Design a protein that fits this description.
DNA-binding, ExeA_AAA_ATPase_DNA-bind (chains A, B, C, D), five-stranded parallel β-sheet, 4 chains, alpha/beta, binds adenosine-5'-triphosphate, about 260 residues, part of a larger assembly, binds magnesium ion, metal-binding (chains A, B, C, D), elongated, P-loop_NTPase (chains A, B, C, D), 12 helices
Chain lengths: ~260, ~260, ~260, ~260
DNA sequence: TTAAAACGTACTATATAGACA
DNA sequence: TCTAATATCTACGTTTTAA
């Protein structure tokens, strides 16, 4: 059924080429080329994870005849309170090696071997605040002993964690600030979402003054809020047999925040 | 419906470029250029807040890609009995940073860190008389360690607070006094309100010298009285089916003060 | 461009060798030789901080290869409500050490260890009235257990704090008073500013009675008022296109105080 | 392409004969002659690891007939929370003995066996604060049982760790303080970096008053920051087809710190 | 079986830092 | 005046290994 297909589409996710994504990718290309360790910092739901995820797809593994893959970018998200072994597990699994059970030292040695062997040059650690204090020493050694740019991605909680150890603070001084949407950039973003994400049979004109006021108030400039509001409002409108987001459906969703 | 929209327009606030606002804005430009700390003082409802608010909107943040915003002017109104962590939290949140739970020393260092880098050069503290005596020492250190023109705004209750601390009084001697207004510029201001603010379909002729008399007696030269009387007179007159504000309604309002 | 460069200079700070600075330095040199604790007291904006900075800058940290630096004079300004660890952190970070997380006892032992070996002989605590009552016991123990001249600096607020602990009062009772300027010294100080600080392209003649009499009334002999008035007056005169401070701008500034 | 060769060079590392490196090496020569155990302490990114690693390249293993190679200096960096087995493994592996599986007592006896006969006379343990308090007993026994100068290297955290064991503290009392760069030595280092490290087609004149202020603000005297900033600024400038680091690029890099 | 090495997480003993009366 | 809490700071001992 068309409705079930449209709900299945709007239910999911998609990547939109926002300008802050291009900013990050160009900045990560510099840091990867200079092989330079750094941090990406920005408040929650500003889009940091989707942007870093888009970067590893742009720099997918590359192949040579009869050789292991070169994997320039490794992207991992640690689990909460990540110790050394869980960091080493995360990295080696991303490189597609099922490391046989063993000591932390055995996991460390195998991780160094595959980080060298697969030609990894950038290691993005998303939610780096989830690392234990003892684990940043292993992250620093990967940065120092190998020619690898390590990127710590997090909120202002990461900035607070990093300040607790001079040796991490001084290795990750360079930062990019991921920011909220506002002003005309927000209005351009709303229009892109209508045309590219929602793709409803009839134009909703979300950029118009009253609609834009509702969205500005409810989203507060978070791209996470903008995406979740408009997708649910699109699903509610189509479930009611409407061909567009209507103002009443939008305010009804916006009133839940 | 006509009425509900215009009532909602009159129910909201507006800004008008009065000569007092223009005078303050030039004075603040001099102080910001010189990095001179100073105070703005004057009776309630003389328009100090609206003038200081308009100054930050005229000097809005500049964004550049992947950096924290360049924010030349920060404007804060402290909560009552503001301590130092409250003050630091206000400044960091204005600069679009989330505070992380920590000591006063941690909040201080994070605020000093982002007052740099965001490139702040003026800090306006509206109703500075809400500051605890201990937090004035952090205000003074922001003014002294960084190149920041701190502007204290308040009534004469601010002058009472700062005269009790020698070191605060001497740092904030330079001041501008907001005045109540009467006669010619008052007559112009009344005319400016009926021209630019009330926007009623039919002329109220508040320029009339007898209408100016009753407004002189009630508004007593306070712009915050003048605005509130005319706005209240508009809503009553429109709701009573009148195209106009006239003395029969205007003096019913004016007698209410 | 011309205007921005001279303004960016004039909004800065500069240190003029007043006789008030020399008498402090010759006094602190005698106190340092005797290792004698004492206090410097005087009204706000009399130049106490700038003179103590000048003394600290004449007695530089001396490097010796691979040794910790020999630092004869430490200068600290406590933050407000300075407790023992706050004091110890500021001392040990003035010497080129990081604090490690630890107890008050760990911070004390490390501070006493580095005040020795850095060879400290005078400690200046500027705005010593910010010290908590409890932390004066550690200040007294530094002055008693090591042969260190502790110099407390503040206004009459310091005498109000000190007199409430007779053990502190009786150790820091030797004092020096910073005065208001007056007379021929005030005339001589004004003469220096336009040629040693302002250096506008044309003479301002600030010594002339019609200027000198206004500056007397506006500054009252506070060196901080004298400096900040003339710097702002030069900046405003330049911004109007003038080669010099005119008395019209001098009156335009002096009326703001 | 020439650009890829220069970026590949600038992306790397090099050892500059800084005077503090010479100061350390002269000190380690005295301690190695005396077989005296000691510690090296200084802030993060001050160059301690580069200077220690440079020492064990001067004192590389010997080639000798019919006898195992004399290796005067062993250098190891423990992994985080290094226990004694991991200590012994790193020492034997540095001496190129592939020690098999065994008990800790086997690893101990085999380490003591190869520290003799290789004729080791100095052992440098970098990041010595990573040692468990139980493995410090084996370090002390290496220094006591054999005539070996053990050098413990770390930041101020190492001083705190050593304080917690009387028997370690009294064996490593002698120390060298590795320092930050400042003053004329910083200007000399920026000059040395442009000549010896960046080797760009045209002089960047980074020693100049304008550039030296930008570098001092960003570098704060940390050699680690100096090297990172200048190499990345070079790579940015060459990628833009400049022949040198322009101030516009240097400020653009420095704005990230 | 027999060291003995590696390693998840508990019932505790304190050492503060600071919103309020 | 007097707390919750975010740790520190060892131990609880319990698995895993290989010999
Ligand atoms: N580039 C994008 N294109 C489309 N949707 C996006 C994009 N960036 C963010 N979103 C939407 O915003 C949501 C939140 O983004 P994201 O997961 O990247 O946040 P984050 O900044 O990593 O947050 P947190 O710090 O809380 O983990 C996404 O799940 C998606 O709905
Ligand atoms: N320039 C202006 N343009 C339009 N309305 C104004 C202006 N100045 C004042 N008002 C009106 O007067 C009211 C009071 O002004 P404002 O809030 O600036 O006073 P204030 O001096 O900051 O007062 P207080 O000292 O009591 O806090 C405003 O909320 C608005 O209704
Ligand atoms: N010797 C000097 N040369 C030039 N300017 C000076 C000198 N002394 C004081 N000033 C000016 O006066 C200002 C105030 O001086 P300073 O900070 O030393 O005063 P203070 O007595 O320590 O004040 P407070 O007690 O308020 O902290 C300086 O920032 C500077 O503008
Ligand atoms: N002598 C040198 N010549 C060239 N570059 C140097 C030199 N010393 C330091 N560096 C640069 O500074 C960086 C930091 O130096 P190093 O690793 O030796 O610091 P560290 O003091 O051991 O730091 P930490 O205590 O944080 O581990 C180096 O990786 C290199 O980029
Ligand atoms: Mg995320
Ligand atoms: Mg107000
Ligand atoms: Mg002072
Ligand atoms: Mg190191």
């Amino acid at each position: 059924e068309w409705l079930q297909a449209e709900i299945a589409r709007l239910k999911g996710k998609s990547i939109v080429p926002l300008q802050q994504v291009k900013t990050l990718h160009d900045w990560l290309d510099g840091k990867r080329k200079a092989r330079k360790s750094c941090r990406v910092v920005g408040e929650s739901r500003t889009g940091k994870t989707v942007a870093c995820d888009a970067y590893r797809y742009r720099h997918k593994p590359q192949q040579e005849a009869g050789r292991p893959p070169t994997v320039p970018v490794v992207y991992i998200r640690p689990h909460q309170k990540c110790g050394p072994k869980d960091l080493f597990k995360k990295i080696t699994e991303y490189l597609k090696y099922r490391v046989t059970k063993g000591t932390v030292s055995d996991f460390r040695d195998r991780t160094i071997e595959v980080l060298k062997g697969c030609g990894v040059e950038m290691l993005i650690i998303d939610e780096a605040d989830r690392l234990k204090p003892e684990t940043f020493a292993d992250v620093r050694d990967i940065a120092e002993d190998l020619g690898i740019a390590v990127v710590l991605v997090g909120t202002d909680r990461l900035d607070a964690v990093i300040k607790r150890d001079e040796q991490v603070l001084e290795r990750f001084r360079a930062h990019l600030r991921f920011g909220k949407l506002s002003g005309e950039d927000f209005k351009n973003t709303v229009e892109m979402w209508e045309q590219m994400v929602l793709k409803l049979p009839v134009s909703s004109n979300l950029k118009s003054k009253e609609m834009l006021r509702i969205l500005t108030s409810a989203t507060e400039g978070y791209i996470g809020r903008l995406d979740e509001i408009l997708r649910e409002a699109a699903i509610r409108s189509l479930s009611r047999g409407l061909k567009k987001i209507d103002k009443a459906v939008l305010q009804e969703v916006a009133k839940e925040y």
